[PDB]
Amino acid sequence: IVGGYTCGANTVPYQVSLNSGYHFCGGSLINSQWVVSAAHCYKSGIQVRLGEDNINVVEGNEQFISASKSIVHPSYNSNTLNNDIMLIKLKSAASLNSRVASISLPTSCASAGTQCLISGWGNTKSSGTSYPDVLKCLKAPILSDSSCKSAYPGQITSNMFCAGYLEGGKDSCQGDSGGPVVCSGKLQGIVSWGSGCAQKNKPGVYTKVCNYVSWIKQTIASN
Ligand SMILES: [Ca+2]
């Protein structure tokens, strides 16, 4: 997160870190046994780390649970990042409490102008590299489909939206991928892609979660 703020420990209780020896992506806990993340975060050997603030210090609220199964969206295209969503089933159910909690799935899509909270352990510099140990947050609005398409000609599908600031300075970044965009208490996006980070006229591009709720629910029901 570039241009954000320190969230506060365990204030984003659905935020997970995906660990393969190191933090490599965010995710969102959607029930006791399932995480939503970005398909481009897929790898084998994932440990889901819940209840994290400092990802380098054991602070007392962590739950570390191995993935038992990963499911990349059937239609994920890694070239275009269309359908950049994956589900991860935990080997055991998380224990849910005030600091480790699921986030609601949308029943309807969000609209341009809605403010949302974007969070993660990604890069904090736009012309630099600095990875935080504690969770960072950014409040940002959803941008119009037309401004999103104008920023990224030929690249925005019906499964993507833009959020952030066209002026630059405030965005998600490398290492935030797979993490949440939460709007009015609903998971509306997944950190997906963008040209650089926090660049002028190059907002963040997010997977449009509301398009996937039917797939999410049926997948959970059969797995
Ligand atoms: Ca920790």
Describe the overall structure.
It is a single chain. With 223 residues, this protein is mainly beta. The protein folds into two domains: 1-12 and 103-210, Trypsin-like serine proteases (Thrombin, subunit H); 13-102 and 211-223, Trypsin-like serine proteases (Thrombin, subunit H, Beta Barrel). The chain is 7% helix and 32% strand. It has helices spanning 145-151, 213-221; strands at residues 5-6, 15-19, 23-31, 34-37, 47-50, 63-72, 86-90, 115-120, 136-141, 160-163, 180-183, 186-193, 204-208. The chain has a seven-stranded antiparallel beta sheet. A hairpin with a 3-residue loop joins strand 2 and strand 3 (23-31). Bound molecules: calcium ion. Residues 52, 54-55, 57-59, 62 line the site of calcium ion. The site of calcium ion has 7 residues, from loops.
| DSSP E strands, number | 13
Strand composition percent: 25-35%
Spatially, the strands of the biggest sheet line up as 1-9-8-11-12-13-10
The biggest beta sheet is recorded as: 7 strands, antiparallel
Radius of gyration: 16 Å
PDB class: hydrolase
Keywords: Benzamidine, x-ray.
Assembly: monomeric
Entry title: Crystal structure of trypsin at 100 Kelvin with benzamidine
